[PDB]
């Protein structure tokens, strides 16, 4: 029923400039008071703007320092957050939020849109076959991986055999490597399946348009 | 400027348990709202006004608190109660920074695999190796790196799972990175996993000089 649908975020350099979308949907968005709220890496959520239904009440986190607009276009449904001069400590996922009564709980919260504030350029992954190698195992079950290398900025989506081996699978959250992300994903299978029955991680990075796959073959020694 | 402080920061329980967690103000404010999150998606309204359950929120959970003090309750928990809660009230800029609830379960001890760098990888210049440690309880293991039999410590990256959401274990990754130049240097690599499930380590390795 009640939609909120966030648009407008991605890599932004420092000192620029960028406006948010938020999307409403299923209910009189103008008897509503909106808000947008702000996670950062470290999981800290901040108040970053507050309007009132009418639009002419407002009111801003207290890192704000006026580089953040709040509007709302009651005709068409929709919130925005201008943000400008930005910096590093602005680098969050940008929540909008819709207000219940006059103690400001926020009933409804929407997807979030991704804004990354750095000098970092958007970076395709290098992706890498994980055999085991000269570290043969022995057991009724294996385990292979994939490591995902290099790229800019989050996320990527691994999936292995197309999804169809969704069971025993392991994608590590990704860490930062000479400013540049890395992961890796392990998937186990039994031992009698492969090589017999071929294995193949499946590396998607949409914001570089890149798809590659990687057959995990048994390495030539 | 009020601020709110929240403890424990994290905490464990089986299901079954009764947990309680705190929300503190630096003075005195009322009408406090609790927000649950679990890992990719949006904070939830779960407690509001103090004491009010959102919709949905079973009537295990509540809320209460005056002045500077404020409290979330789960009566039995359960499984699906596990998640992060985040106090906020009106007039407070930054929300409280959290209590994530983890769910306690039975020791177990990681399935240790290793992988030397790929050809491919040591083509371009670079050697990861890589060593999982999948399926483990509790969260807190000891991962250990020795090149030709000493400790390495230097260039080692880990990275554990959120607990995993159908059998409560934990599985991390231990990446030592190295040029290829370095790694061609040296010969024996072992990954050492040290959890308290054993007094004896878990032990992963190979000779590069082998394949
Ligand atoms: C309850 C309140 C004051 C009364 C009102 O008509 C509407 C609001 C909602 C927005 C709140 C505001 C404050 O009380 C000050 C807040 C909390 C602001 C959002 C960010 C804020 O400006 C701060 O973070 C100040 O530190």
């Known amino acids: 029923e009640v939609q909120l649908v966030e648009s407008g975020g991605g890599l932004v350099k420092p000192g620029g400039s960028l406006k948010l979308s938020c999307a409403a949907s299923?209910?009189?968005?103008?008897?509503?008071?909106m808000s947008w709220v702000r996670q950062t890496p470290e999981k800290r959520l901040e108040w970053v703007a507050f309007?009132?239904?009418?639009?002419?009440?407002?009111y801003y986190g207290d890192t704000m320092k006026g580089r953040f607009t709040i509007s709302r276009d009651n005709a068409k449904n929709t919130l925005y957050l201008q943000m400008s001069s930005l910096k590093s400590e602005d680098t969050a996922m940008y929540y909008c939020?819709?207000?219940?009564?006059?103690?400001?709980?926020?009933?409804?919260w929407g997807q979030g849109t991704s804004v990354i504030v750095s000098s970092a350029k958007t970076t395709p992954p290098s992706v890498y076959p994980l055999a085991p190698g000269s570290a043969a195992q022995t057991n009724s079950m294996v385990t292979l991986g994939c490591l995902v290398k290099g790229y800019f900025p989050e996320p990527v989506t691994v999936t292995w055999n197309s999804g169809s081996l969704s069971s025993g699978v392991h994608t590590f959250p990704a860490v930062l490597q000479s400013d540049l992300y890395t992961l890796s994903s392990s998937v186990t299978v039994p031992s009698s399946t492969w090589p017999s029955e071929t294995v193949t991680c499946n590396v998607a990075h949409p914001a570089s348009s890149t798809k590659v796959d990687k057959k995990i073959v048994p390495r030539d020694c | 400027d009020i601020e709110l402080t929240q403890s424990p920061a994290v905490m464990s329980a089986f299901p079954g348990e009764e947990v309680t967690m705190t929300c503190s103000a630096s003075?005195?404010?009322?009408?406090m709202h609790w927000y649950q999150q679990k890992p990719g998606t949006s904070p939830k309204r779960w407690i509001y006004?103090?004491?009010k359950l959102a919709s949905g929120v079973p009537a295990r959970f509540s809320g209460s608190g005056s002045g500077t003090s404020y409290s979330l309750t789960i009566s039995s928990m359960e499984a699906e109660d596990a998640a992060t809660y985040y106090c906020?009230?009106?007039?407070?800029?930054?929300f409280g920074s959290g209590t994530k609830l983890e769910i306690k379960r039975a020791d177990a001890a990681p399935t240790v695999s290793i992988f030397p760098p790929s050809s491919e990888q040591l083509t371009s210049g670079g050697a990861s190796v890589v060593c999982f440690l999948n399926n483990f309880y509790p969260k807190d293991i000891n991962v250990k790196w020795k090149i030709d039999g000493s400790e390495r410590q230097n260039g080692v990256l880990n990275s554990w799972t959120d607990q995993d959401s159908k059998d409560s274990t934990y599985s991390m990754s231990s990446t030592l990175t190295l040029t290829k130049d370095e790694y061609e240097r040296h010969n024996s690599y072992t990954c050492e996993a040290t959890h308290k499930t054993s007094t004896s380590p878990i032990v992963k390795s190979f000779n590069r000089n082998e394949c």
């Open positions: 299923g209910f009189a968005f103008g008897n509503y008071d």
């Open positions: 003075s005195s404010i009322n009408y």
């Open positions: 906020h009230q009106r007039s407070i800029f930054t």
């Open positions: 006004d103090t004491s």
């Open positions: 309007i009132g239904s009418g639009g002419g009440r407002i």
């Open positions: 939020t819709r207000h219940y009564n006059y103690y400001y709980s926020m009933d409804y």
